[PDB]
Design a protein around this ligand. Structure first.
Ligand SMILES: COC(=O)c1ccc(O)c(OC)c1
Length: 283
């Protein structure tokens, strides 16, 4: 069903996608102990989840003042959108994980540390992703099937994950948050470029689909960063990820609110995980 567009436009999910779907994925509350102590997360498993199949995995971070339960709470209801999109064939089934940057020494900035050491091995040893094992080697070998995104301060988390975790993660969805490293947009872009240089990866091996609202305060700092990134050779600007690797979706009229941001995930998540995928698909 899915075909890449080169300049995909904002489109909310239908209102009916915000109500429960009969083909409901299971949401599992987990508790684990890592470098920031004992913490919890939620795991969304697609309807029909079969542990003898391999699933893409997308980790998705909340914003400031929120927690690991927010995204699947009544205030956001992202699972309804996921369920309906998967049932209708718009989105290939995947695992979605909602962790937290709260707890212990954890911050939105430093969460990537715990992500690498604790969250990936805990989740991906339990559930069936493309990681055949959860050693560093097994995680790195399955990076094309792993993504990270997040909203607001979780968008910041996403950028710090990118710069520090290119070895583990190929697809990035920063939502309404910019990267706070540097005193100018060029410093930010140059930091991302240096991370890419250090990783040794090609431009066909990492993908950034950023989004915000045209009335979302985060635009002010995102837009200059995006423009600086577009000028790098490291990024080829287009939503057609069969051709390039970088897009910035700006929703007209949308403000800094999960009510809109959930629709950015509806629009962007279907674009993830088809490059070097293991199924024979035409997009
Ligand atoms: C409440 O607002 C935010 O958390 C916020 C707003 C604007 C930003 O550019 C941003 O980047 C991380 C975060």
């Amino acid at each position: 069903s899915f075909k890449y567009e080169s300049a995909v436009q904002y489109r909310p999910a239908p209102d009916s996608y915000l109500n429960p779907c009969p083909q409901a994925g299971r949401i599992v509350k987990e508790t684990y102990t890592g470098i920031n102590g004992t913490k919890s997360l939620n795991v969304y498993l697609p309807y029909g989840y079969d542990p003898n199949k391999k699933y893409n995995i997308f980790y998705l971070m909340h914003g400031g003042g929120e927690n690991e339960n927010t995204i699947f709470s009544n205030d956001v209801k992202l699972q309804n959108i996921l369920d309906h999109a998967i049932m209708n064939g718009e989105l290939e089934p995947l695992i979605v994980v909602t962790p937290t940057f709260n707890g212990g020494n954890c911050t939105a900035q430093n969460f990537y540390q715990e992500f690498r050491q604790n969250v990936i091995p805990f989740v991906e040893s339990k559930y069936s992703t493309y990681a055949e094992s959860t050693t560093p080697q097994g995680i790195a070998a399955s990076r094309m099937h792993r993504g990270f995104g997040g909203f607001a301060m979780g968008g910041l988390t996403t950028w710090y994950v990118m710069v520090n975790c290119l070895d583990y993660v190929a697809y990035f969805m920063p939502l309404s948050g910019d990267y706070w490293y540097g005193n100018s947009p060029q410093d930010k872009a140059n930091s991302i470029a240096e991370a890419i240089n250090r990783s040794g990866l090609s431009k066909r091996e990492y993908f950034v689909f950023a989004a915000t609202g045209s009335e979302d305060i985060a635009y002010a700092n995102m837009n200059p960063q995006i423009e600086a990134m577009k000028a790098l050779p490291h990024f080829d600007y287009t939503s057609d990820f069969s051709k390039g690797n970088f897009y910035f979706l700006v929703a007209p009229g949308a403000t800094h609110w999960w009510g809109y941001v959930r629709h950015y995930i509806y629009d962007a998540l279907p674009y993830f995980f088809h490059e070097l995928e293991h199924h024979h698909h035409h997009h």
